[model samples]
Target chain A: MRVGERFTHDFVVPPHKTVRHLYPESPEFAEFPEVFATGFMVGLMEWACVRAMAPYLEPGEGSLGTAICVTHTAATPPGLTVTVTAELRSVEGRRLSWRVSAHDGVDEIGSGTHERAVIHLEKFNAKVRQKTP
Target chain B: MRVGERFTHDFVVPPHKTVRHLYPESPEFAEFPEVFATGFMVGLMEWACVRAMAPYLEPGEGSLGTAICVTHTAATPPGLTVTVTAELRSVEGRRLSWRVSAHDGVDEIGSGTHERAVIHLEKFNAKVRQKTP
Candidate 1:
């Protein structure tokens, strides 16, 4: 999959459950951490995840992001619907990359390149736990 | 590190630079994709990334997340300073996990678990780019 190809996810931006606040001596009851609640940053990564899989040969085959380098650009309040779209621009064998972006009903919040590698689930899981387990 | 063990990052949440919206008809001037944008999701993952390395034996060591299953819990407007903290809740050898959370100056936005594994970077990176590369 190359640059112009696109993939999207039907995601709902839940209310007051989006991003979280880290400062201030006191916070409000209706602040940060919107309805979706994984923290505002997680939303964009999810979009990237949804899109990076666009070139999948089989949905049954598991894929994981090998690297992700980007920045968050805006904030989306709850009750809004966000659709994240990702375009495949770089694919070097199993090393795949995407130029990804997202949108809430209001605007374009973020964009970046995400790299993922297709892998066998059993082997991947087993290898990681071996050293420490 | 347990749930109560707190680790913090002096993260500066860029202004109007937090999240991206995916819906509505036309996009906007200061939409999502805040500064340090990788989509909102990546931020939390990053905080997870930074925190997961806490138990590392060497700064030169490399580690990768094996599994990250979380929901975007909130929306953070740009310019607000956000600090994400993660606590080690589950650790079974190389399979390490954390119960993480984040906040902007205004409130507590999101929290979740992020699991990772330590690995030899050179070997790990070399393997994934293969077969498909």
Candidate 2:
């Protein structure tokens, strides 16, 4: 991975991405306020990071999430668009790190750092298989 | 919030919680692999922290996510149950911190720290309203 590499992705928050839709089977999440869920926000950040690093990886190579340090400070309603950006900040062997930030159409929503591990898809799939019961 | 308090929650990963369901509107996520989406895992961790502190909040009180530093280390397929546990580790006024861990039916899947800010529902809702333009 090369440092300073960057990418941005924009998408609107749909109803299915809300807290209410995250886990409808649970009453706990059922009562969760209607807005952009923190969970989905994390996914958005991950997607940004992965896409940013895609061109740097060899074919059949993928990255796995290792750590995330982020804050979802603002409430964003559904239908609003959030533009997330990720910048490669560090790379050590198979480990890659990025500084990530997000802004809703009206205001900044979240920011922080994320770390991912690059791996050969075949090897990673083998590890995934070992976890399967 | 009181330090040393702890709670645990267990739930099975269902199809709807997968990456495919996270953003079906986008063919990008539609083609996402059929493993536990990191987004849903973050939600599970948040649920554990919230439930752990639910009894400490006054009526009409709620906590908003401020920060999360988590790592989802293993892949878990649908139908497998994941048990997430949270323990209060620090409390400073309205800010609360917790140590979190999660185990899928067969392996440890995630672990890390989460921070939340307590808020008055009325005040928080007003802020939410302001963001809705």
First chain TM-score in every candidate? 0.70, 0.94
Off by over 4 Å in 2: none
With a 3 Å backbone cut-off (N, CA, C), the pairs that clash in candidate 2 are: none
Worst 10 residues of 2 chain A by lDDT: A24-33
Task: For model 2, give the TM-score of chain B.
Answer: 0.94
Tens digits of per-residue lDDT for model 2 on B14-119? 7677776766665545655567887788888888888788778899888778888888788887788999989999999999999999999888988989998898
Candidate 2 local Cα displacement, residue B30, angstroms: 3.5
Tell me how far the alpha carbon of residue B72 in candidate 2 is from the true structure, in angstroms, after superposition.
1.8
Which one wins on lDDT?
A: 2
Predicted candidate 1 versus true structure: per-residue lDDT over A29-56, tens digit per residue: 1232222332343444544454456346
Interface RMSD values for the candidates, listed in order?
Answer: 18.5, 1.9
